[PDB]
Amino acid sequence: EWNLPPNAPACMERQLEAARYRSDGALLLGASSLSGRCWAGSLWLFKDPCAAPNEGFCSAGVQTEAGVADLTWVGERGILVASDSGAVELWELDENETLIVSKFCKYEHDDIVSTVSVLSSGTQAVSGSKDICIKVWDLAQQVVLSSYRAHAAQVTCVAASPHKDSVFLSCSEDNRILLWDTRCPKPASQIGCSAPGYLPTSLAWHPQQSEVFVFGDENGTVSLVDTKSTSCVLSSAVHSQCVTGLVFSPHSVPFLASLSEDCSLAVLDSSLSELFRSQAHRDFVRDATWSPLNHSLLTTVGWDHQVVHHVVP
Amino acid sequence: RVSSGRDLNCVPEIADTLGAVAKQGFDFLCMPVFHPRFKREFIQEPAKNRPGPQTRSDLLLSGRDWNTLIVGKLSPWIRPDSKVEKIRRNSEAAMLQELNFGAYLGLPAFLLPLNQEDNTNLARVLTNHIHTGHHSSMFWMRVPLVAPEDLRDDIIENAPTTHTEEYSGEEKTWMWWHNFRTLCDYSKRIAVALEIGADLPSNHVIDRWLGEPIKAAILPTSIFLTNKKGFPVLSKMHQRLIFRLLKLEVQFIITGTNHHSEKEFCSYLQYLEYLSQNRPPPNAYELFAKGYEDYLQSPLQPL
Amino acid sequence: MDNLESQTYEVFEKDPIKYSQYQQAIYKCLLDRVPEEEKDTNVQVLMVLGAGRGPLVNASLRAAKQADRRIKLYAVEKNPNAVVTLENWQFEEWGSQVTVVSSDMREWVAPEKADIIVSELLGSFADNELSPECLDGAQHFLKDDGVSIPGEYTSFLAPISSSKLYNEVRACREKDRDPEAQFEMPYVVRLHNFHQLSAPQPCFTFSHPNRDPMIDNNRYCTLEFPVEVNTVLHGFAGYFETVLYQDITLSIRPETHSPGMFSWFPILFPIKQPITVREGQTICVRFWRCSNSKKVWYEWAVTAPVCSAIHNPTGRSYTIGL
Amino acid sequence: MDNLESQTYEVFEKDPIKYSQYQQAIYKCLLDRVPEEEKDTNVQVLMVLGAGRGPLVNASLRAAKQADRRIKLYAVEKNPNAVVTLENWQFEEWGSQVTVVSSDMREWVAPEKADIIVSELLGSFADNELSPECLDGAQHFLKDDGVSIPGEYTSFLAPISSSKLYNEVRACREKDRDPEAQFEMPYVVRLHNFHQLSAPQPCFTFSHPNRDPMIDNNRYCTLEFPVEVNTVLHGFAGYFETVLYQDITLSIRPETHSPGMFSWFPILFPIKQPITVREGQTICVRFWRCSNSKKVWYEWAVTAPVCSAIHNPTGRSYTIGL
Ligand SMILES: O=C(NC[C@H](O)CN1CCc2ccccc2C1)c1cccc(-c2ccccn2)c1
Ligand SMILES: Nc1ncnc2c1ncn2[C@@H]1O[C@H](C[C@@H](N)CC[C@H](N)C(=O)O)[C@@H](O)[C@H]1O
């Protein structure tokens, strides 16, 4: 409580949903209240990473109307948020960076918005909902440009390509992984390792080779995939529960972080062999974000309200 | 006058939300009893031992309010028919827990989805619950006229929507419901929540639900067209179905966000009320026969 | 064996007597247990067993800041649904003074022993909800000199005449079971159109803690009821009394009934056939409390002035599960 | 849950195969366990679980003076009446080499751990006598590297057609219970006037010892039966196979049936309504094994070519007690 700035609420909701380092080195926090009287969420900026989750030593904070299902930095001051309310919302960070203020809140989805990714230009984003839709947004205009009912069940994860504005991956509980390219008149192409396996639950583009990605499934397996020869290259049984997130290090030879509902973090090399493992969390592991300053530092949040900083050999 | 209800999948505060939807005109609310995103673990350490509460308190409402105003929803992550053993186990327990909680609260009804062909294990767990304790609570199966897979935009390059008409495959959805109620041995406790889409199917695949115990019809906001003066209305063909459903007396459920930000939600609802007002009035027969619909009596033997 | 619904906890929470009687029992016990000069240094560990939605927990707290003494509280409840209410209470209000445990008291491994176990696990015939078995499974974590609340309970029985209730039981025949099961199980009922043929007499007694080398909760009792009108016996009315602490008691025996206490109605034990009784005769009834590891039950018979079938032999028509 | 009568033990003791197969399984295991140079210095501790009137005990002894190895025997039996026979055997014959224990193997406190637990607690559908639960409660006294005999078992199912047996089940309707309970419980029967519609397939498997961190004996299995005549399904036939030791096995699956072995007849799982099956169709059946702390049971359904009611939901018509 030593700090607790204006507009910031006294208490941070127990269920830590997301953690993302800005390029300047500061830590963004999304969190939801998933039990108890009030079902809501809040947004946090921590210029002192080591100080989090302590509400006291934070740079800014704010209550959202509902819980936060996903979020992502938009450039440097922008916070884009996937809501329970069905809304995607933009929160603009202060010019002094001590207030977080609603930029827009658009109620466009019909169920919880579960997933959100920023497209490489930074002027547009794709959101994925339980309403089975995928939506493409103009951030400056505050509008949905395109709506896509490509899937047959709820969408789990949408991931913008690092470098091309019209390409992204989505995956849904209808067993499909769609490779998108909005320039085609039929934008989705179903490209899953096409033996109907286990439902895909998490996606991550390779940051260098703009044409390989990874997907994790509900069974704890992580898989490396080439888009051009589509013969699912590598796979390893990394987890004993669903794999909920996949995050590549900023290294030029990147390591892959992998988080699970088995409450464990793993770090894997480019051929998916296990380098690291952490049981430090005692509830679900929800996100992982690598330090821009120190490249062997990795931060995880969980539903155990732990913000944990890892040193990676 | 219609009896209608709001469907939400997000309730930040139960006290306020209920107020809003009463204010908006609705007779009742469909909401989750646990957070829809709050996946629980039942078997594996550590997550098993997650500190409680598991959900919000019953004290937040009066008994009266619970018995009369709240229809529960199954958490959408619960999948008793997963291919994955562990998920299937957690789902078994999770479903029990949510169901037991509805019973505890004395909810009048409770919604479960049929959104795939195979619901054998869902059926079993429900059948199990139904024969455990004594309660009169209703179970509404949320079944769509048209399967989600058959409503998808034709926008996958390498998986086109199979265009040629199939008499059977446009009925699949009924067979989903058929098998589920056959395995539950036609429990009187299990009824239908028919979900209407923008594409009303072939007239024959609607016929199908003739005779079935439809207790409720679910209208997504998305299917309302707009009149020349910016207000929500329905296509002529959708209007037919409404009059048919009204004849059979069911409850109507509005689901989804506002898509005509011009006015409140109460516009959608007003329109139903509008359609209900605009039925022909009962004939003399229909007035006499009113309380007798589907009520079996012995034939008289005046001899 | 079943989980109480929310509206049930709600109705009975409204009792104007049961709770303040409990408060008082805890308040007297707290004083007897920590002498004045210890008031700030001795902190009593208190366990509620079957906390419900927590009104005994509040009552324990009210007792403590009235005795001006200090307590640690465990709130143990098997009903996961009620446990939801408790855990919202301990987050919103009680704070870490109360520890909520979600388990069966027969199963729970206690981190520490208690000064005082508090419970109300009693039905209209005292032990018909298996309060003996439950507290027997819990007593291994009561300190060697610990107090149980309640300290003891005793059931009672009176013979009655009622053609009206005889008919009600009769009307309880169902398909797919013994055509005479209705008669071999007890009903909770606000007995109204009936006559009491003799004054109630004690039947079964249990004390807590129970420091018997060999514990046996089974029982067999013979009662002898002087009858001084001519009549027909259709049943036995059960009641109970319980000693919470010392002189602080609860009763539904009508001689000593606790004023205002609506929480328990009488129980009715019926008989398959009505029995003629002439003025001057003695009614002799017999009651057994029986059990195995899965369930407990009653069997009973009338042996004077004529005999009747042994009722419920084996708990064929009615058991209470463990 | 019930005590076998003497004449029952007598009939099955006459089996010409079950016992010598057991002897052999113990004999192979004894050799694998004590190397030649240890033969006089290593004395293997052997436990029979469910000794009955003792023929496994004699069989263990016969195995030992055929392997020329030395054994200590515990003979554990819950049936006090059978225990009478055992104790007359150990006084008149076995001497102190055999220790007879009269208790449940789930309850017994073992003075020492075993090299080898031996049992035959199997019914016609393998695990329908609760051999899993029983050996699971006993395994805490099997040495860290101990052998169970048997090592594993697997049940099987085949769909059948029989109007004759459909009628027999029908004829099993009783007063005072569900008019359709006959159909929701399994029968042991020497199936004769019937047709097997598809080849049997594995259903449930259990291994012993079971070193799962979390042990779960519940199950759910889906089978798919290719059918190539037109017919009516009235039931499922169950059989089983068990691995005693290594390659020494027992079977009542007719493909691999153990010659001469009359000890187990097939089980029949019936269905409330017969179901039409056309040549070319698949029969899909589903079986679940369910339980609580008191009892275990099956529920099953047919989901293709048409569905049927879920059978026995809750074990309302049939449980096997713990
Ligand atoms: O058996 C029934 N209906 C067929 C009869 O032949 C109806 N007729 C109609 C003609 C008639 C006229 C005088 C007296 C009796 C009758 C009975 C029947 C049985 C139970 C109830 C009713 C009933 C009772 C009230 C309102 C409508 N229907 C009707
Ligand atoms: N063996 C047990 N372990 C834990 N809780 C139990 C057990 N047996 C009964 N209960 C709970 O004990 C309570 C008994 C109630 N009559 C009292 C509830 C509450 N203290 C009240 O007075 O409102 C119920 O909530 C039961 O669910």
Ligand SMILES: Nc1ncnc2c1ncn2[C@@H]1O[C@H](C[C@@H](N)CC[C@H](N)C(=O)O)[C@@H](O)[C@H]1O
């Ligand atoms: N949990 C248990 N504890 C002790 N004995 C048991 C238990 N369960 C079953 N039994 C006994 O196991 C035996 C099983 C019999 N099929 C085998 C008997 C004997 N060994 C024989 O083959 O002739 C019966 O005598 C049962 O009474």
